[PDB]
Symmetry: C6
Subunit: 93 residues, 6 copies
Amino acid sequence: HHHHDALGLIETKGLVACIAAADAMCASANVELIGYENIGSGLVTVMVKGDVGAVKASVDSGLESAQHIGEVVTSLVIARPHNDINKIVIKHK
Amino acid sequence: HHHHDALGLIETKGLVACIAAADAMCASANVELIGYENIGSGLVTVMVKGDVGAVKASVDSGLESAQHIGEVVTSLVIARPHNDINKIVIKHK
Amino acid sequence: HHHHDALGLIETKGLVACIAAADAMCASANVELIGYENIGSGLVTVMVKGDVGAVKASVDSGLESAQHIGEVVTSLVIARPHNDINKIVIKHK
Amino acid sequence: HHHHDALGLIETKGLVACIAAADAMCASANVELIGYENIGSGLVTVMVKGDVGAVKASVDSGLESAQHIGEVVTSLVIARPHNDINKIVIKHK
Amino acid sequence: HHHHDALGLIETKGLVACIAAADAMCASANVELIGYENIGSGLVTVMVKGDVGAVKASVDSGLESAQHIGEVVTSLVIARPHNDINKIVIKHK
Amino acid sequence: HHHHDALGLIETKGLVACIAAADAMCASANVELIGYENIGSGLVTVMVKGDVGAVKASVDSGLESAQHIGEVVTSLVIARPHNDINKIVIKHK
């Protein structure tokens, strides 16, 4: 009995646009900032978790804020991520 | 007597498209998410293992899901990988 | 009762332009140089903290100085960053 | 009296094309997969060792297999590598 | 009473052009080679310290030498760097 | 009384072209392979040391061999490197 739903992701080119996204994501909805990763070629991803409605609102707000200061490469909301995807997500905690 | 078949791989430009691929791969077939690697230039690879039919279905589903949110660089199914290729695959476990 | 407002960021392509920005940022206003990060693709970010007016003056000065010797990718002032953004900012301390 | 000939190398842009090359290299000839390295800009190199004829056959097969799924940057067979080159090769073991 | 002025920087694309710059910088003036950093995208920076006149002469000489063998991205002399910039400079010692 | 002249460098885009250069460098002259570094953007540098004539012959041979299989970014021979440049060179030993 070990204790540890939706996932929202924004990937930008550059760290500052990513921080703008994360700030807007947290300010706009009841979500938890749970992921942060830089993979090279200047790509930086911020990840949030929370209820589906909250995550969708958070990603929309993050996109608007990031798009005004940098390049957003992509964005995604996964409503119910597969359990096995947690193995990748915890690597960017 | 030490105890540890097909391999499916999707490589994308960017982490979010890779996570979309991994999620679709796991949801669409009976496969295990066994590999994850980022090599620079924003290239990220997710790898799955399972029976041949399952791996083929998993890679097709991952490709469709990833292509709608990012750039897929390439994809491959190796039905019976050579034993020596395990030496590279375990580096990205 | 543990003891540890505005955040200013400049992202450049190349380290020398970033150092020119950080020097001008510190010289032009009462701010603290609190962040420094390199994320690949030659992107380097310098971060400062202080009162809002000070941070705005610091970022304007850093931009002018960096733009004369290199490429500024972007700049931003976050007047009151969300508490959860501190989790990302301390990673680049 | 310490105990530890030809070297075959394939460099691709992307990991999946490299794994396709390594698989074909091992399947097509009596060679040992002895090197694997990622140097940035998405460049990945796989290295094999064995008898000259075997290494030449292995590199030709690896090239054909990799070219069908990704970009091969270059390939090379060194029949009798200089002893001092072992100092670089062991870094990518 | 702890004991540890001008800063000269040259940033090139590639390590060899950087080493050519550092060699010319040291040969042409009474400066100390105090910094060396590689930030990705092949950008390499060499930093020297000394009296203002010496640093200016050193950077001019380094630029001429590096420009003949590679790409110089940028160069800068900071006559009296802000004390807080030492926090970034010591990271590349 | 601590005991530890010319320096030859070849920088290529990609590891295989670099290994081809290092092999030709060692085979063509009485030089020691003393440096090897990868700095990102796929740039790889090999460095040799020896007598001036030997180093010049070694770099010419390395260039010819590398140019036939990959991109040579640059090459250089420093006949009598400044003592302070040893501080950078030992970082890539």
